[PDB]
Design a protein around this ligand. Structure first.
Ligand SMILES: Nc1ncnc2c1ncn2[C@@H]1O[C@H](COS(=O)(=O)NC(=O)c2csc(-c3nc4ccc(O)cc4s3)n2)[C@@H](O)[C@H]1O
Ligand SMILES: [Cl-]
Ligand SMILES: [Cl-]
Length: 539
């Protein structure tokens, strides 16, 4: 079947050893070099590779001394902090599965998530502690809570350093610690949760094989960023999520200084780029809005920035092109993936550009686009459901065989739930989620196409589009809009503006509501249910 698109061979073959073994090898190299691994952009606190490696080894030993066995479970519950990856790496080193969560989860989300992954120990931020204590009342198998981002014991709980000290012999040498080899294709490494699900979070099981595949991509000269220890990268994405998890772990294999930024005011954003000489960043779409509007770019030395990427959610082609132009860059790089594919499986290849494209199939992967009804493969320039296959496919959901069966078909293809197409040169374009398409008469209108038009308006800061029920037409496209400060548009002004830019079918017949915040998930995807609820309310 010539409709299947097959990715190339990676420049760097997948290395032998577990994901823990590989991380240890590279971290040790950068440790001896004296490089910095993590920097908190706002405080300027650094962890060297040497310190991060030492603590990760010491925590690995501590978890073994505590009694955790291969295929045990720990969790994190934390907003981004520079300590976040210590329990992750320790788990990978010893073959204990790690379930990351964020403090920003609701209690309903967190109780469900941790109830599925069943961690023995939770590494909680100070901020997340109250939620973890509450969850423990239901998930009563959580034995121990350790405070991740405190140097001292906190509210009666051991901090990370205390837990390590209490579970390792005095004078324990990290250099002596051995990574634990595992059955790479079978051994769960991480239990992850997607963002923007319409239901409660499922536990996505990712293996060591999944992760070491990512390590090849991450440092690939075409599909990643080349090893360059000391080079700084800015990161803004949530660490608990696959997007932040596998970009960050990849950056550690690359030897980069991971500059973690948690505040997105333009001054701090720009000052961070300048002060740490950041050479690249992967943004989410809302951060592009800040950069397109900024009147301050000229005040900062931004000359070190040679790459801007995007992922997680649809990016307006025109907004991306404007921002790339401001920075005098050829274009915005992009990656597209799902929690269930570990990381990005379509990435813009260096040297092989195409306006508006999401990129090309990554090494070791295959992709196809199927007809929504027949499920048969399609040629180029035909919209259908993107499906993918390759060694980053998850092992399956935790204790949910039905959901696994629905996602990964009898022929081993993962059905992404996304609409897209590929062109004659095999560039893929991801349009939107199938579930988001607005059923206006016989049309299937992608909200992202309307959102792009809205975002391009200089008075519109943010927008989200969804379908308003309608007896005659099925669904009418409607929009929720956040206006830029000091600007005003009426509903009619927005509707007329959109009508001037789109087909008749795409008009905002469902109307426009103005809000302070567009409802979205943790990595920028529009919350359709929430938008529909807002549109339902009378003005
Ligand atoms: N680039 C994109 N364009 C449009 N939509 C995109 C998208 N990426 C994810 N999505 C949407 O998120 C859904 C998946 O949501 S999810 O489960 O929460 N997981 C993800 O969103 C997810 C998991 S890993 C990951 C990426 N890793 C990267 C590494 C480098 C890089 O440059 C870019 C990326 S994006 N994204 C997709 O089905 C799709 O609807
Ligand atoms: Cl999201
Ligand atoms: Cl979310």
């Amino acid at each position: 079947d010539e409709n299947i698109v097959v990715g190339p061979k990676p420049f760097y073959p997948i290395e032998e050893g577990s994901a823990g073994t590989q991380l240890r090898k590279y971290m040790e190299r950068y440790a001896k070099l004296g490089a910095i691994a993590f920097t908190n952009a706002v405080t300027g606190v650094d962890y060297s590779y040497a310190e991060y490696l030492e603590k990760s080894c010491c925590l690995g030993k501590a978890l073994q001394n505590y009694g955790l066995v291969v295929d045990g479970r720990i969790a994190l519950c934390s907003e981004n902090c520079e300590e976040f990856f210590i329990p992750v790496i320790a788990g990978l080193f010893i073959g204990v599965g790690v379930a990351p969560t964020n403090e920003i989860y609701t209690l309903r989300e967190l109780v469900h998530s941790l109830g599925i992954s069943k961690p023995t120990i939770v590494f909680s931020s100070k901020k997340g502690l109250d939620k973890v204590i509450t969850v423990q009342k239901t998930v009563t198998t959580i034995k121990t809570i350790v405070i991740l981002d405190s140097k001292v014991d906190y509210r009666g709980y051991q901090c990370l350093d205390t837990f390590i000290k209490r579970n390792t012999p005095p004078g324990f040498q990290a250099s002596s610690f051995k990574t634990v080899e595992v059955d790479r294709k079978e051994q769960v490494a991480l239990i992850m949760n997607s963002s923007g699900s319409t239901g409660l979070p499922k536990g996505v099981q990712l293996t060591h094989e999944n992760i070491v595949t990512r390590f090849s991509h991450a440092r690939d000269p075409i599909y990643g960023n080349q090893v360059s220890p000391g080079t700084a990268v800015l990161t803004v994405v949530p660490f608990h999520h696959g997007f932040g998890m596998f970009t960050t772990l990849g950056y550690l294999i690359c030897g980069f200084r991971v500059v973690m930024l948690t505040k997105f005011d333009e001054e701090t954003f720009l000052k961070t780029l300048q002060d740490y000489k950041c050479t690249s960043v992967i943004l989410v779409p809302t951060l592009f809005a800040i950069l397109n509007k900024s009147e301050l770019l000229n005040k900062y030395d931004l000359s070190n920035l040679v790459e801007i990427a995007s992922g997680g959610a649809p990016l307006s082609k025109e907004v991306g092109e404007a921002v790339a132009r401001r920075f005098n860059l050829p274009g915005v790089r992009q990656g597209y993936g799902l929690t269930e594919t570990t990381s990005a499986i379509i990435i813009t290849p260096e040297g092989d550009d195409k306006p508006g494209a999401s990129g090309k199939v990554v090494p070791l992967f295959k992709a196809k686009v199927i007809d929504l009804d027949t499920k048969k493969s399609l040629g180029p320039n035909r919209r259908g459901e993107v499906c993918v296959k390759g060694p980053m496919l998850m092992k399956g959901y935790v204790n949910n065989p039905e959901a696994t069966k629905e996602l990964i078909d009898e022929e081993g293809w993962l059905h992404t739930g996304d609409i897209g197409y590929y062109d004659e040169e095999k560039h893929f374009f991801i349009v939107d989620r199938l579930k988001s398409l607005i059923k206006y008469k016989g049309y299937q209108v992608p909200p992202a196409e309307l959102e792009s038009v809205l975002l391009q308006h200089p008075s519109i800061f943010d927008a989200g589009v969804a379908g308003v029920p309608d007896p005659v037409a099925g669904e009418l496209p409607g929009a929720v809009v956040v206006l830029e400060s000091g600007k005003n548009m009426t509903e009619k002004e927005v509707m007329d503006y959109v009508a001037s830019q789109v087909s008749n079918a795409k008009r905002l017949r469902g109307g426009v509501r103005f809000v302070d915040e567009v409802p979205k998930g943790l990595t920028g995807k529009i919350d359709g249910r929430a938008i529909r609820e807002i549109l339902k309310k009378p003005v």
